[PDB]
Short mmCIF file of C-alpha atoms in Angstrom, two decimals:
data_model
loop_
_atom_site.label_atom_id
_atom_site.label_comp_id
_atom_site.label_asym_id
_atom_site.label_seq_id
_atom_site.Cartn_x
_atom_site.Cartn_y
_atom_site.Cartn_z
CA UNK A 206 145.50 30.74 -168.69
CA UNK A 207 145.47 31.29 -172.47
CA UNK A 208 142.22 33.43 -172.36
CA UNK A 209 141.64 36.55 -174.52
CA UNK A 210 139.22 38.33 -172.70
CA UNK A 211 136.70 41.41 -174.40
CA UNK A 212 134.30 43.35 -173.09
CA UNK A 213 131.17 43.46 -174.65
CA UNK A 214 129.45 45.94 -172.64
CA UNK A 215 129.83 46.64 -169.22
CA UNK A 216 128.88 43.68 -166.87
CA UNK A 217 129.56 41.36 -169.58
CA UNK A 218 132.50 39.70 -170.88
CA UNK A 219 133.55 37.43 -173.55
CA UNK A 220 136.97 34.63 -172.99
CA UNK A 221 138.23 33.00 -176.21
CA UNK A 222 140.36 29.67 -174.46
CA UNK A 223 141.91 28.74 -178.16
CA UNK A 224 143.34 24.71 -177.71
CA UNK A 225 144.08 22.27 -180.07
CA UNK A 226 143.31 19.51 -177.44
CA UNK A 227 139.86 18.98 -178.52
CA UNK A 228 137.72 18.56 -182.06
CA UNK A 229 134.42 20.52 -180.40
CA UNK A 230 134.24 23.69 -178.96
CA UNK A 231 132.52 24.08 -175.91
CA UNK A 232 130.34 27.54 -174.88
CA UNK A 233 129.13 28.66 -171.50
CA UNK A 234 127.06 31.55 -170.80
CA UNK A 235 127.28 31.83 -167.39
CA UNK A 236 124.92 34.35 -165.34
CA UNK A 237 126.42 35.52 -162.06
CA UNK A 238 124.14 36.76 -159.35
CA UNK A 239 124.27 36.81 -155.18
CA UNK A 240 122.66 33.98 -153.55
CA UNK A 241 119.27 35.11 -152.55
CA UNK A 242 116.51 33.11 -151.35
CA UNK A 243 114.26 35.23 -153.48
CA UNK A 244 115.68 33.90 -156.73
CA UNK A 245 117.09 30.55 -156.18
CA UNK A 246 113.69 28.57 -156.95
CA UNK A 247 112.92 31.23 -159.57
CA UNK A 248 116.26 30.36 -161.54
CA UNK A 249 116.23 26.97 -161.21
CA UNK A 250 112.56 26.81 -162.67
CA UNK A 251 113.71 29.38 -165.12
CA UNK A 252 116.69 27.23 -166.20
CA UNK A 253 113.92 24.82 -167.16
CA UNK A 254 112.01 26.66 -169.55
CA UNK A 255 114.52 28.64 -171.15
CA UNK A 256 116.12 24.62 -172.05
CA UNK A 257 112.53 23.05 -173.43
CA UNK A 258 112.05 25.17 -176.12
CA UNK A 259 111.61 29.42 -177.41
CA UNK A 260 109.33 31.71 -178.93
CA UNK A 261 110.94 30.19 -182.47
CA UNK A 262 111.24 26.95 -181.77
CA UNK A 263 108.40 26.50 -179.33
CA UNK A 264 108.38 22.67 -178.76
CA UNK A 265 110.95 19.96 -177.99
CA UNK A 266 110.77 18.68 -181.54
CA UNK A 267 111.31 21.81 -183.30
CA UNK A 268 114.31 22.74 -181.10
CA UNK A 269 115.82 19.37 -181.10
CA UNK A 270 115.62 19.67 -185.27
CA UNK A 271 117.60 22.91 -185.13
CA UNK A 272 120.19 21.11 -182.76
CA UNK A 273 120.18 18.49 -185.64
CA UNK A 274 120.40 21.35 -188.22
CA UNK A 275 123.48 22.46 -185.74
CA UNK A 276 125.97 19.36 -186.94
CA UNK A 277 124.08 17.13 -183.78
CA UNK A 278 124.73 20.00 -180.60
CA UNK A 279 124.66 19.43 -177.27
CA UNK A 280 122.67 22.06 -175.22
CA UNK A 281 121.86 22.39 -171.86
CA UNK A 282 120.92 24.83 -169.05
CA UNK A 283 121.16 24.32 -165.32
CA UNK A 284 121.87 26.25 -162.13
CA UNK A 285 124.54 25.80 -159.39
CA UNK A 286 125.90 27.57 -155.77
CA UNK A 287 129.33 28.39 -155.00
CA UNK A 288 129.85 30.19 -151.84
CA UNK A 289 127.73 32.99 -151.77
CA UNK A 290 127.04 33.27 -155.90
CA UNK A 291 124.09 31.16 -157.65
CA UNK A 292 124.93 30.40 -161.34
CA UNK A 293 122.64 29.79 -163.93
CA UNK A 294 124.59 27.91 -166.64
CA UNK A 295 123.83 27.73 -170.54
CA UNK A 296 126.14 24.84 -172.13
CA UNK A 297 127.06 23.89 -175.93
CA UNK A 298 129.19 21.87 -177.36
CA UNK A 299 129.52 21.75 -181.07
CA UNK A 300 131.99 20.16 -183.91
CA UNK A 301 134.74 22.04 -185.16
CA UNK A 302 134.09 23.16 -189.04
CA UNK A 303 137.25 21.85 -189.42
CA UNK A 304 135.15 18.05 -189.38
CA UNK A 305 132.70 20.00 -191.27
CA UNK A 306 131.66 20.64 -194.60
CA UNK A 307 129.47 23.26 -195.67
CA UNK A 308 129.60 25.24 -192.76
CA UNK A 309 129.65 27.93 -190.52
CA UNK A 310 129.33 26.37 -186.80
CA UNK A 311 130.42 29.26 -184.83
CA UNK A 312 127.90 31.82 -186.21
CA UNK A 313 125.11 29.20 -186.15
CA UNK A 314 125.24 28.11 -182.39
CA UNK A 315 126.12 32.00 -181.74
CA UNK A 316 122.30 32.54 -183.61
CA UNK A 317 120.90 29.68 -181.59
CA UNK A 318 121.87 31.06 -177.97
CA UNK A 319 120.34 34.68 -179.20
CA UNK A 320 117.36 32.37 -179.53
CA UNK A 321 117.67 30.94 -176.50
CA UNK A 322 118.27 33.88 -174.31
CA UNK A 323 116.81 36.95 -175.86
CA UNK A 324 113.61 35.16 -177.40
CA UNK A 325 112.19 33.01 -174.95
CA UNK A 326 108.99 31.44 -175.22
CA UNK A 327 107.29 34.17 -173.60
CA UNK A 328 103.93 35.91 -174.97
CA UNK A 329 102.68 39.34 -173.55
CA UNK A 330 104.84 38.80 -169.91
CA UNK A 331 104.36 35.39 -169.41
CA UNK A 332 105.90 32.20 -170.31
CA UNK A 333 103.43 30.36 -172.42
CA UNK A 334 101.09 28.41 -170.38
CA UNK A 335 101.51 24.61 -171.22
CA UNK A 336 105.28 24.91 -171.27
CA UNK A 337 105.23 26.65 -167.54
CA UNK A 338 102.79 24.12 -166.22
CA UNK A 339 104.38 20.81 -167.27
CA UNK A 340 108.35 22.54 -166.04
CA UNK A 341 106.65 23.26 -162.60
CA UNK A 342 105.17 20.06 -162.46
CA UNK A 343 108.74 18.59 -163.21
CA UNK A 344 110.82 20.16 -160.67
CA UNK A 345 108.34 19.89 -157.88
CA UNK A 346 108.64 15.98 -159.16
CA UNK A 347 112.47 16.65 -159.06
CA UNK A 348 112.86 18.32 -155.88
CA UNK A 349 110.17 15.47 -154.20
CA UNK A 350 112.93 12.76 -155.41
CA UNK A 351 115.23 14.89 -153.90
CA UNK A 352 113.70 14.78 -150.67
CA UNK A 353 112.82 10.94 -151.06
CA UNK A 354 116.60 10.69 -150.11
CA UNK A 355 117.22 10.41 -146.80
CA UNK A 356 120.32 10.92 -146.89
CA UNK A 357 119.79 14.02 -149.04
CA UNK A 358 117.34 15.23 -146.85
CA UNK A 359 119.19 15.04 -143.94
CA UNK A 360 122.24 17.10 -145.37
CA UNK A 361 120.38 19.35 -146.86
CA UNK A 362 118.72 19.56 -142.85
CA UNK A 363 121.66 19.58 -141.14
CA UNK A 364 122.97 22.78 -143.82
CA UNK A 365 119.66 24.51 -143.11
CA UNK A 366 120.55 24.37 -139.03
CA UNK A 367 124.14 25.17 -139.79
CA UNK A 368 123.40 28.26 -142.11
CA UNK A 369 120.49 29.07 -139.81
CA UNK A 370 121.28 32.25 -139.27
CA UNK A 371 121.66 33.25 -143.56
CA UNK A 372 117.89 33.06 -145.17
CA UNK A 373 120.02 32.69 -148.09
CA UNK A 374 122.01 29.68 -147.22
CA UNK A 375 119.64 27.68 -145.52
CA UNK A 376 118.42 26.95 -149.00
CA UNK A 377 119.94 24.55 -151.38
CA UNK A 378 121.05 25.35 -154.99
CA UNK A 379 117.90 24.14 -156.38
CA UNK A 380 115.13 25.60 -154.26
CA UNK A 381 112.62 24.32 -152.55
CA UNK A 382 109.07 22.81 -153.15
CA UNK A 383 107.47 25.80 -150.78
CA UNK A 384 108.89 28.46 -152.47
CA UNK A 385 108.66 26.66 -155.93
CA UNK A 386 104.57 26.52 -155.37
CA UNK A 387 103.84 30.24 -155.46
CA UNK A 388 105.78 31.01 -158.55
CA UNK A 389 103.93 31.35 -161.64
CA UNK A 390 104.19 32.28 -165.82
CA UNK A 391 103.81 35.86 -164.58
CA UNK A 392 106.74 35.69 -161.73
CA UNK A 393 109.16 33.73 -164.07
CA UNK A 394 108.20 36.37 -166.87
CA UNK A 395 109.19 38.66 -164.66
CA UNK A 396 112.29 37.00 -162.66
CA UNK A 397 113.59 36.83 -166.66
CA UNK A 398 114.06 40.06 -167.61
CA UNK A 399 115.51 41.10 -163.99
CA UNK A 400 118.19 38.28 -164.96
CA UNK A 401 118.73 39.44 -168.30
CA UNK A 402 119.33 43.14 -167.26
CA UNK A 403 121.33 42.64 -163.64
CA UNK A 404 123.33 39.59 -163.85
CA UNK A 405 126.92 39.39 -163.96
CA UNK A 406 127.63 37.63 -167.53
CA UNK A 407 130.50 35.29 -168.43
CA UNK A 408 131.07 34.05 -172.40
CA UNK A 409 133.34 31.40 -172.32
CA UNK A 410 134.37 29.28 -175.52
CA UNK A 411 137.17 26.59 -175.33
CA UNK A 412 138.57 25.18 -178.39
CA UNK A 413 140.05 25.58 -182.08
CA UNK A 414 138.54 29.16 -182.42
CA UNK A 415 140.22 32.44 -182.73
CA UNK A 416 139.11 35.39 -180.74
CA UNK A 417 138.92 37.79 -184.17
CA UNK A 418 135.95 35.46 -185.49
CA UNK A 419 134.40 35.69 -181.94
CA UNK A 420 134.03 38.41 -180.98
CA UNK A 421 131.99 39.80 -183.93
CA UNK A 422 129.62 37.41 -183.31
CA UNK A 423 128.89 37.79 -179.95
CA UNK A 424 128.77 41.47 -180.19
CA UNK A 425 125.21 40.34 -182.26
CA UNK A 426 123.78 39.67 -178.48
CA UNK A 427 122.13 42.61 -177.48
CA UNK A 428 123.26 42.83 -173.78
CA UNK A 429 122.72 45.96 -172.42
CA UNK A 430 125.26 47.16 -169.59
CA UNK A 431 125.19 46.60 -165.83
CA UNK A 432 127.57 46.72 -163.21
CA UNK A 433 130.87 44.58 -163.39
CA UNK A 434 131.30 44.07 -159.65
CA UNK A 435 130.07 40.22 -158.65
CA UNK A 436 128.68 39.16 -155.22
CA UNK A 437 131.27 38.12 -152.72
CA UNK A 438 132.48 34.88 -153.66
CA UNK A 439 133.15 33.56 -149.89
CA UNK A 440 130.63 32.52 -146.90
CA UNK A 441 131.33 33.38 -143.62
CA UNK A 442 129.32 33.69 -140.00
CA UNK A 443 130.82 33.84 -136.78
CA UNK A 444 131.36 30.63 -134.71
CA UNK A 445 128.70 30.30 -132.09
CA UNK A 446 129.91 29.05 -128.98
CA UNK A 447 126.80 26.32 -128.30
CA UNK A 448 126.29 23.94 -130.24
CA UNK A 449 122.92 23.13 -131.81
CA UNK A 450 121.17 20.22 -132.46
CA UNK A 451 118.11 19.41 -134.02
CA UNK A 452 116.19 16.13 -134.38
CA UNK A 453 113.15 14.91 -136.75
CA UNK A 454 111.38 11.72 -136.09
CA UNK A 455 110.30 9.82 -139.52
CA UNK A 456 109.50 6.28 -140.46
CA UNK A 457 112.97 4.70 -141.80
CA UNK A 458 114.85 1.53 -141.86
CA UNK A 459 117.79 3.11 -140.69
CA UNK A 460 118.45 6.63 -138.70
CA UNK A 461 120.95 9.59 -140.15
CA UNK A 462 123.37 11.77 -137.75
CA UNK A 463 125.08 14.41 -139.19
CA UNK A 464 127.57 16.86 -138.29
CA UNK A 465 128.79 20.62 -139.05
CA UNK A 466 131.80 22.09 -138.42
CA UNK A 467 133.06 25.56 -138.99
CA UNK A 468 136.44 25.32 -140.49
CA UNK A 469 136.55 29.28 -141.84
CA UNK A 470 139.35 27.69 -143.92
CA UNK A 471 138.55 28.57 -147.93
CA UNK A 472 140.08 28.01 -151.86
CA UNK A 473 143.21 29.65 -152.01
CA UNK A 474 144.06 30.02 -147.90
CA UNK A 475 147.05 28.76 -146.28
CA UNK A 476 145.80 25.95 -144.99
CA UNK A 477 144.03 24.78 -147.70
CA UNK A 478 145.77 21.75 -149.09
CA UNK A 479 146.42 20.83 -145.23
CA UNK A 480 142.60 21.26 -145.19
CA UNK A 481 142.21 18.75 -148.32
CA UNK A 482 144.77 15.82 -146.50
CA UNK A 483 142.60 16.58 -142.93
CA UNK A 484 139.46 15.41 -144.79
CA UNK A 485 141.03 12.50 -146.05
CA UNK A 486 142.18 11.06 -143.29
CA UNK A 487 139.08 11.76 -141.33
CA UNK A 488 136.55 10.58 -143.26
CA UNK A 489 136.92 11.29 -146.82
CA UNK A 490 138.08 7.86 -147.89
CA UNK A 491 137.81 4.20 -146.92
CA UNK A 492 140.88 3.98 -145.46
CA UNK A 493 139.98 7.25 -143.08
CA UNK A 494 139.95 7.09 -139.42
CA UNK A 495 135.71 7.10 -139.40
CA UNK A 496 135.51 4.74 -141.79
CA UNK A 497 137.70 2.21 -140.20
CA UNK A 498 136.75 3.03 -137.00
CA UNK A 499 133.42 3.87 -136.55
CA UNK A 500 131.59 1.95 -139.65
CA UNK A 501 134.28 -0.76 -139.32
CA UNK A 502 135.37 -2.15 -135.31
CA UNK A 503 132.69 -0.56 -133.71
CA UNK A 504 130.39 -1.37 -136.55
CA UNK A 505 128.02 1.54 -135.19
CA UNK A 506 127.50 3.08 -138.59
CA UNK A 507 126.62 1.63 -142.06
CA UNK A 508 128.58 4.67 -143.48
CA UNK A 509 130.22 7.61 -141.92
CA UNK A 510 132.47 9.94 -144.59
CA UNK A 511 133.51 13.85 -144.22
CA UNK A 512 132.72 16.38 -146.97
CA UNK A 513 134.39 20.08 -146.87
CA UNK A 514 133.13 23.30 -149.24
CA UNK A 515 136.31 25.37 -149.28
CA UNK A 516 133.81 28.24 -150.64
CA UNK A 517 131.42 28.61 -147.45
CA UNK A 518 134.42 27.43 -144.85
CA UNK A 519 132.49 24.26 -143.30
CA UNK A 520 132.99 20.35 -142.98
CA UNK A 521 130.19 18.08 -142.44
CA UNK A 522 130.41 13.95 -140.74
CA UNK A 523 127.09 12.21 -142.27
CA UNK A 524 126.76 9.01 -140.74
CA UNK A 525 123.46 6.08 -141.58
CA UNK A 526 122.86 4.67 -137.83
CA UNK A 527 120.64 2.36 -135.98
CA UNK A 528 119.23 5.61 -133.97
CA UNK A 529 119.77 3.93 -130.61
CA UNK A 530 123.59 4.49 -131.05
CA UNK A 531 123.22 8.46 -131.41
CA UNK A 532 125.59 9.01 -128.49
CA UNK A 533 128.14 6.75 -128.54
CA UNK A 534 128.81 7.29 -132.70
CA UNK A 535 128.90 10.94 -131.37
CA UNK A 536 131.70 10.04 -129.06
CA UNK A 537 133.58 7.45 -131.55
CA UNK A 538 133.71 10.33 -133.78
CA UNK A 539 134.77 12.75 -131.35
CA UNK A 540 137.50 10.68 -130.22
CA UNK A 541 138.82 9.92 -133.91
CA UNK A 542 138.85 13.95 -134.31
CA UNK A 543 141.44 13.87 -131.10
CA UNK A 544 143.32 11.51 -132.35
CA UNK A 545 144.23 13.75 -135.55
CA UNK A 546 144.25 16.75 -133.35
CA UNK A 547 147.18 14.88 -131.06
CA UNK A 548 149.09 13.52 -134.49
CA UNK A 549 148.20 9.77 -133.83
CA UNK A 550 148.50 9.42 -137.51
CA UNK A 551 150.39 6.38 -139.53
CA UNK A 552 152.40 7.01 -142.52
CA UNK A 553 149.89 4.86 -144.75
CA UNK A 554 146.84 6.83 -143.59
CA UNK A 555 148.48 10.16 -144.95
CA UNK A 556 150.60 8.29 -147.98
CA UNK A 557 147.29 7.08 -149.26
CA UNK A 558 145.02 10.26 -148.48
CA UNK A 559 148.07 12.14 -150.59
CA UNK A 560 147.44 9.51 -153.86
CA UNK A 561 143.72 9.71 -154.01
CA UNK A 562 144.03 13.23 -153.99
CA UNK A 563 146.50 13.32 -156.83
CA UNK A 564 144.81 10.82 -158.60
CA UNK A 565 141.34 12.41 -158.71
CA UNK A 566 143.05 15.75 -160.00
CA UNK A 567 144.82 14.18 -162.46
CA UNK A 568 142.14 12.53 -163.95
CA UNK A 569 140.36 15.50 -163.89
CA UNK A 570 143.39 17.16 -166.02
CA UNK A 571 141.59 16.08 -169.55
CA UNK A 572 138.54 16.99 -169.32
CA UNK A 573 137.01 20.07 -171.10
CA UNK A 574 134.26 20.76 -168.64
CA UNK A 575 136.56 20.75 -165.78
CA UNK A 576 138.92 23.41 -168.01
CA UNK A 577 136.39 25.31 -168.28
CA UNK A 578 135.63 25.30 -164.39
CA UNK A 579 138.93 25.95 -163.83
CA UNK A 580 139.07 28.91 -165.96
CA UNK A 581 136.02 30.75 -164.24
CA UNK A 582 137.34 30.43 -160.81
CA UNK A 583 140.56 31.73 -162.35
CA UNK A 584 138.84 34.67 -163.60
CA UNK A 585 137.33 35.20 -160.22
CA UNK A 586 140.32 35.06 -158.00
CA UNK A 587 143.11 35.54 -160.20
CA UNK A 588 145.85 35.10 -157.73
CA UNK A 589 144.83 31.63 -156.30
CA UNK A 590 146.05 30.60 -159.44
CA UNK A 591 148.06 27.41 -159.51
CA UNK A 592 149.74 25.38 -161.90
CA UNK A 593 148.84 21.50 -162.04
CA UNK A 594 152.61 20.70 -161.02
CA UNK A 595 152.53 23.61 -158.22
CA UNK A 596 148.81 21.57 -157.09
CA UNK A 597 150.75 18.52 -156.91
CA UNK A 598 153.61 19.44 -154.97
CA UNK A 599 151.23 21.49 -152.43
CA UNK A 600 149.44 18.20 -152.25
CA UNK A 601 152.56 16.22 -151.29
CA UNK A 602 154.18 18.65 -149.35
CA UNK A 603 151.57 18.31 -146.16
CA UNK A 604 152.62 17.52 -143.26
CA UNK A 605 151.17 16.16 -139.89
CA UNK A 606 151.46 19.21 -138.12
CA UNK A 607 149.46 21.34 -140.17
CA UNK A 608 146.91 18.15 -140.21
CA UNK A 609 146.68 18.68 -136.79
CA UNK A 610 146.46 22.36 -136.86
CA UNK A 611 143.56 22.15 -140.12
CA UNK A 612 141.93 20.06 -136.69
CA UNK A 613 142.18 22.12 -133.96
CA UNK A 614 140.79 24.70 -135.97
CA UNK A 615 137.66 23.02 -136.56
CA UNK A 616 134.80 23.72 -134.69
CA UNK A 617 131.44 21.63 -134.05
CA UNK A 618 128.41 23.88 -135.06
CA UNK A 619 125.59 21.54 -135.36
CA UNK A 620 124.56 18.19 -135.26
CA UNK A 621 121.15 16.88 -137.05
CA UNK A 622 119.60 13.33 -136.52
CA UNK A 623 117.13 12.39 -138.23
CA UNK A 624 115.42 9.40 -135.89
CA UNK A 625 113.67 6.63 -137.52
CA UNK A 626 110.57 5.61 -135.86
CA UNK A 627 109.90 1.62 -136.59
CA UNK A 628 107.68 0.91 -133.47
CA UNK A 629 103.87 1.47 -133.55
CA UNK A 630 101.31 2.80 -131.37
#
């Protein structure tokens, strides 16, 4: 990493990422704070109306005119999970003055996130009234799409029965429609100025800048200190030895069975790149052993794929079913996770998993967001730090034994199946 790195007061911390690579400069103000089920709805709301407008430019149309004023900005806020951290996420992006004319681009957009996040549009502790109502009529809107999903819902399910022993994990990234009902211009008031004073903040700004102009600037934002120490990145529980399985009946066209595994494999372990072949060749790709197996020759499943979170150490199978086949696509599954266990794997199965890995990375290699990204996690764990040629190699070097190993460590946890009911009376 090229970062220059400054504290601005305790807690919070500015990284200059100077490139040539691009003619914008991106900005993230990243707020860093332990997953809590508590706060997750309450952030994700917040994220809303801190983004529609501010106590100075209190509607859409004023602050979309001072984006204008800004050389045409991009801004954006939003929330995410990683592991055990929920980050709530303020983006710009903003032309170089270099493409400018009469300008002064850096000190502008530095003004226009004061705005944002130390004059919200908040009168005598609470957010005013017509802006609160319509954002909490939008994400329960959002959050009922969400649920619409039944694919969604049912990994978002089968996570809730998998995490069921964190209240904290058992909730997604984004909250829930429950918890979002109770909160109010009062509790978001509140929530606000907890954030503000507690969180964990991260400045970064990637592009043709220098960190002497910088830091000046955001030394204008009047953080005050709190402690530097973040949440745990990592998830953990301990393996239980029964499995459990849940079931909900609704009316669908077609029925979902998922699956959780514990794989207590995470970013920067030994057998993570084994980990990222394993998934591949299981069911992360159409050539994987579920997807020609199970969806295609059996044809028991209209779509069966793996997913792993190398943050929170699990794997999940989510399969689309006619529900009647619950046990045997159980089975078929179970038997394609033996065969990888024993090493019944063909050269093309592991050749191909290898080039859409390196492919997708690759790709990924341009793009200022995923920089970005890449720097935070950096700055998190700095020794899981790895070159894009040292990723590659890794990548290639897997072999089958430590695909069979990354298997015989996993463990079933949970299974969810969500059971379409298409017969009356």
């Amino acid at each position: 990493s090229n970062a220059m790195s400054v504290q601005l007061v305790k807690g919070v911390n500015l990284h200059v990422i100077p490139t040539e690579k691009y003619k914008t400069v991106r900005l993230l103000v990243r707020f860093n704070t332990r997953l809590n089920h508590e706060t997750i709805t309450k952030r994700t709301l917040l994220s809303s109306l801190m983004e529609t407008n501010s106590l100075n430019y209190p509607n859409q149309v004023k602050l979309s005119e001072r984006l204008a004023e800004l050389y045409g900005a991009s801004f954006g806020i939003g929330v995410s999970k990683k592991g055990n951290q929920h980050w709530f996420n303020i983006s710009m992006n903003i032309v170089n003055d270099h493409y400018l004319q009469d300008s002064q681009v850096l000190a502008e957009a530095v003004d226009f996130l004061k705005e944002i996040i130390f004059a919200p549009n908040i009168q005598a502790g609470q957010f005013e009234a017509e802006t609160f109502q319509r954002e909490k009529e939008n994400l329960k809107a959002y959050l009922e799409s969400i649920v619409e999903d039944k694919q969604t819902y049912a990994s978002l399910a089968l996570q809730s029965v998998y995490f069921n022993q964190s209240e904290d994990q058992k909730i997604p990234s984004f909250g829930t429609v429950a918890a979002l009902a109770e909160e109010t211009a009062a509790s978001l008031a509140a929530y606000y100025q907890k954030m503000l004073a507690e969180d964990q903040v991260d400045i970064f700004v990637l592009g043709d800048v220098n960190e002497a102009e910088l830091v000046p600037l955001f030394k204008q934002l009047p953080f005050t200190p709190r402690e530097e120490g973040k949440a745990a990145i990592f998830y953990n529980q301990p393996i239980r030895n029964v499995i459990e399985e849940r079931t909900e009946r609704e009316v669908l066209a077609q029925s979902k069975l998922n699956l959780a595994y514990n794989t207590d494999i995470y970013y920067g372990d030994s057998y993570y790149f084994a980990l990222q072949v394993f998934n591949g060749i299981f069911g992360g790709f159409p050539h994987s052993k579920l997807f020609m197996n199970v969806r295609e020759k059996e044809h028991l499943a209209y779509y069966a794929s793996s997913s792993i979170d190398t943050f929170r150490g699990f794997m999940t199978v989510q399969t689309g079913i006619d529900g009647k086949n619950r046990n045997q696509v159980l089975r078929l599954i179970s038997t394609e996770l033996e065969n990888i266990r024993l090493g019944k794997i063909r050269e093309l199965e592991i050749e191909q998993t290898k080039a859409m890995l390196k492919n997708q990375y690759i790709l990924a290699l341009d793009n200022a967001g995923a920089w970005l990204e890449k720097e935070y996690l950096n700055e998190l764990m700095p020794q899981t730090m790895l070159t894009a040629e040292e990723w590659i190699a890794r990548i290639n070097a897997v072999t089958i034994p430590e695909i069979q190993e990354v298997a015989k460590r996993l463990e079933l946890q949970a299974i969810f199946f969500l059971e379409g009911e298409t017969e009356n009376d």
